[PDB]
């Protein structure tokens, strides 16, 4: 049974997503232009920096997140940011040409664009496999926002001080997701769907690891760090 509290949780997360994800992509005017020699780094840095701000606005609205200490909210956001950003990018991803289509040809990003920001196939090959496997789950919007929230409130992140309380908030979301799939997701789409969504969180841990490896390599060159944003530098180190 989907309890009143569980229906409440889903309504809040749906609204939180709608308030932090603009599918018209109107704010892309503010970013430095794409040029298609890490030519795409300024635009894609600006894209990530904006996405970080939106992920924080979403996180503050997760029920229970703001009962954590400041240090624990910060630990959870720094360690989850690139994972949530990859999850939230799935909305624009298209399997027609394996690209992120943000409403315009100028703002349509393929593997060649990502390599033009300094990243290699060690990241991009698994990233595309991930985007494809997630897209094939055909998540309900309700499932998509629960997954983003569960990703953020993870108790095994390093530096987490009050892991017992992080685990308590995450379990409320996981039981909400598990019960939602049983009551509202018709078969055969629902077959092993929760286990498949948890596997995507595992895939995201490996993608996180490789991202930071490549981030440390490119950001160790000051000529590249000059093209990043202050917020990207605070979050990714």
């Amino acid at each position: 049974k989907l309890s009143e509290e569980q229906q409440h949780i889903i309504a809040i997360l749906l609204d939180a997503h709608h308030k932090t994800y603009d599918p018209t992509y109107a704010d892309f005017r503010d970013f430095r232009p794409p040029v298609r020699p890490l030519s795409m780094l300024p635009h894609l840095a600006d894209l990530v920096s904006y996405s970080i701000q939106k992920v924080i606005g979403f996180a503050k609205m997760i029920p229970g997140f703001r009962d954590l200490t400041s240090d624990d909210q910060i630990v959870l956001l720094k360690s989850s940011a690139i994972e949530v950003i990859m999850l939230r990018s799935n909305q624009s991803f298209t399997m027609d040409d394996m690209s992120w289509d943000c409403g315009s040809q100028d703002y349509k990003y393929d593997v060649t664009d990502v390599s033009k920001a300094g990243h290699t196939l060690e990241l991009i090959e698994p990233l595309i496999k991930f985007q494809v496997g997630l897209k094939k789950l055909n998540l309900h919007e309700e499932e998509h926002v629960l997954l983003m929230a569960i990703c953020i409130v993870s108790p095994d992140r390093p530096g987490v001080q009050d892991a017992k309380l992080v685990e308590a908030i995450q379990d409320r979301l996981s039981n909400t997701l598990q019960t939602y799939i049983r009551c509202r997701h018709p078969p055969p789409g629902s077959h092993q769907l929760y286990a498949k969504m948890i596997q995507k969180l595992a895939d995201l841990r490996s993608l996180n690891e490789e991202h930071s490896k490549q981030y440390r390599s490119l950001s160790f060159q000051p000529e590249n760090s000059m093209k990043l944003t202050p917020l990207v530098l605070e979050v990714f180190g």
């Binding site: 701000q53 924080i56 996180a59 400041s70 910060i74 720094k78 917020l231 605070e234 979050v235």
Partner: peptide, 10 residues
């Protein structure tokens, strides 16, 4: 050591 995150979370 994280002023902008702290301000955004406030």
């Amino acid at each position: 050591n994280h002023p902008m995150l702290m301000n955004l979370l406030k």
